[PDB]
Amino acid sequence: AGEILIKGGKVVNEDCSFFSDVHIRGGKIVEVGPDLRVPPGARVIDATDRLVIPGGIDTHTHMELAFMGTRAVDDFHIGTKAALAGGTTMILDFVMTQKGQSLLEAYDLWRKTADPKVCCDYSLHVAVTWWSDEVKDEMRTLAQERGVNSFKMFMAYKGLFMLRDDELYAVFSHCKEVGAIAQVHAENGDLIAEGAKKMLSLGITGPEGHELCRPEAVEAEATQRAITIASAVNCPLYVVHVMSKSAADVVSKARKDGRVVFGEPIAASLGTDGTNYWHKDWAHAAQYVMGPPLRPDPSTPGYLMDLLANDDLTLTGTDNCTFSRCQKALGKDDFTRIPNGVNGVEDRMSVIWEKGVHSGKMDENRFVAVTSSNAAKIFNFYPQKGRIAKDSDADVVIWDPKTTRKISAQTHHQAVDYNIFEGMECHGVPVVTVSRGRVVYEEGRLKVSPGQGRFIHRQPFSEFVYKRIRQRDEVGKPAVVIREPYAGEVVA
């Protein structure tokens, strides 16, 4: 039948927590209430002394993304298994279209790669790495027909993905017309390009040059710039992988000023820092290289977690894009050749619980909001996911917040052979993971097959995102002053 009763636990949604059992049938939660009856044949999962939470939604992944022909080692199959083992039940991955290439072709290639491999549900964001009439039409098709309401634009990567301010204005205006949210990689690509050339010329070829060539002012600048453009066109904006206190403070100030913008720190920037780039062991230092870089101010992850607790920042992903030690070593002599990307998909939930809830910065309900609910609201499938409620999808984690686990590359399920959180002791253990109403992870073992997950098709004009946008189109139009024509003389 696929019938499950989760009994004895405490349900934790983003608004409040309460003791209740949860009845799962046919992929769905069909009842939430105290002391529910066990129908003959249903499996009982005993959640006594545990929390029963919506499974995590990782807003930010890059499973098996190609770097110069060699692919990230966590692929859609191993990467989603690792997600489940860490309490995350959905991933949103970026379709990376090359400059001049069809976005629809790249979307089809992502679906054909991911559909037969994912072990949990997923969806896609689509990168807009160039601009033309064709891109414009393909974005409308993606939004209206292909289930994608999120487009990602780059202010970094000069010559490769970067768009200039005039093209960002056009692309953002078009996001707004099709009801999508505009995501941005906010670092100044002209400064990165110059900074890297400068560090190499000085013989700083190691990972410390990767951070030194683009310190946090470069990320803060472009973040304010994207906000200013999106505000000029009334387009909702999403700043992916916020890595620094000063970029987080730009998003914080803009939201207090009423800008429709959301900021997304990732597990890496919440759980570790960039002092690792200065480690004497080259291999250790290269493990942390990603764009934008982790920051060498050690107060950074605690401050980003304070701003996530306070809703200056709103939700979390991992930017999981993993490369083995032998793949990182492509840039042993030149940091610009190190394939960028770190791990996180598996450890996100425990890292945030340990650094955010156990530390007393946020409570269990805000934890659910920043790890599933807000993702579901922004990308338009709430309360289908991100809530324990009748009629929601049965993507459910039984969570032990009292026991600790030590995070280690020796025990993790990711394909990558190191872990940037190596050694960390976290309160908060996913003990059972249910995905699409099936037990896919329990007693430390995965039970799931490649292709069991499904692509989630979303509609455009997410209400959480657009209700203010649409009201501002109605009352915020600029008005002419009514005047008599100017009568006087004009110079020759």
Ligand SMILES: NC(=O)CN(CC(=O)O)CC(=O)O
């Ligand atoms: N890493 C950096 O900071 C500079 N590089 C980034 C890298 O590719 O590791 C940018 C460039 O190629 O100009």
Ligand SMILES: NC(=O)CN(CC(=O)O)CC(=O)O
């Ligand atoms: N050295 C790199 O990984 C260059 N990367 C930079 C990044 O991933 O941020 C661009 C790409 O992968 O196409």
Ligand SMILES: NC(=O)CN(CC(=O)O)CC(=O)O
């Ligand atoms: N860690 C990285 O920089 C990987 N890359 C991967 C890509 O987006 O091409 C960019 C990002 O993750 O920010």
